[PDB]
Amino acid sequence: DYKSITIATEGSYAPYNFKDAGGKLIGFDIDLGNDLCKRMNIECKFVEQAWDGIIPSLTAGRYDAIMAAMSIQPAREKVIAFSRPYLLTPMTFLTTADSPLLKTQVAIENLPLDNITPEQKAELDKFTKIFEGVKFGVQAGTSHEAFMKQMMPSVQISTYDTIDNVVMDLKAGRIDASLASVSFLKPLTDKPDNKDLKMFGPRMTGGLFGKGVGVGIRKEDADLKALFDKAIDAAIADGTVQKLSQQWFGYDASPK
Ligand SMILES: C[C@@H](N[C@@H](CCCNC(=N)N)C(=O)O)C(=O)O
Ligand SMILES: [Cl-]
Ligand SMILES: [Cl-]
Ligand SMILES: [Cl-]
Ligand SMILES: [Cl-]
Ligand SMILES: [Cl-]
Ligand SMILES: [Cl-]
Ligand SMILES: [Cl-]
């Protein structure tokens, strides 16, 4: 059935999906998308779509798939189907190198949120108390915003159209902190450009964040999902996902 497909991406989330000097779409999602389509024997075409409206445009049939650093989270699973994860990454916090937030002790280094034990709640409640009075910035319509609204409601948040504006305002001093995956924050903080920025706090997984990043497909497209899952399994097994992860992220975030 599928001879050619249209894949949507945002183009504002480096190193997953962004634009080069000549304005062409580049990144991990573009390289993986093209490699998966070569395996599937499907012609590949990448389109730019803003984050707000990326899910409704998929359901409306404007394109066939989404490859835009999209977590397989339970709220999204109610609307669209996902492929098996092509990348696994926890979530962490971001601040400036001079922030007093960096002197706060982390009791639980890795925080799994599917089940929240009293000890895990105590750690989340500690950070909530510390984050009150502190200005937070998040990209709108992400699991970052969902986390802040559900798990830390007492904390003041500002929502941004893109993650680039969040980073811009954090450097300008208009916000004091943020949150994203380690897959986004490690290559951002590894840059000598961003020596003034630091990752801090616990590394969270599960709950509302779900498990991994997957390809977004329509629920009625069961055959396209099966094709993507077979292609992803083969790309993981031969070391392609590991090779592309080292290239774009500077570390191995591929599933095992
Ligand atoms: C991996 C990535 N996932 C977030 C943010 C992705 C936003 N993607 C985009 N702007 N293209 C999410 O699915 O809510 C992250 O937490 O860092
Ligand atoms: Cl491209
Ligand atoms: Cl093949
Ligand atoms: Cl799975
Ligand atoms: Cl431990
Ligand atoms: Cl190769
Ligand atoms: Cl290459
Ligand atoms: Cl590594």
Residue numbers in the entry: 27 to 282
The authors write:
Two Agrobacterium ABC-transporters and their cognate periplasmic binding proteins (PBPs) OccJ and NocT import octopine and nopaline/octopine, respectively. Recognition and import of opines are conferred by periplasmic binding proteins (PBPs) and their associated ATP-binding cassette (ABC) transporters. The PBP OccJ is associated with the octopine transporter of octopine-type A. tumefaciens while NocT is associated with nopaline uptake in the nopaline-type A. tumefaciens. OccJ shares 47% sequence identity with NocT and belongs to cluster F within the PBP structural classification.
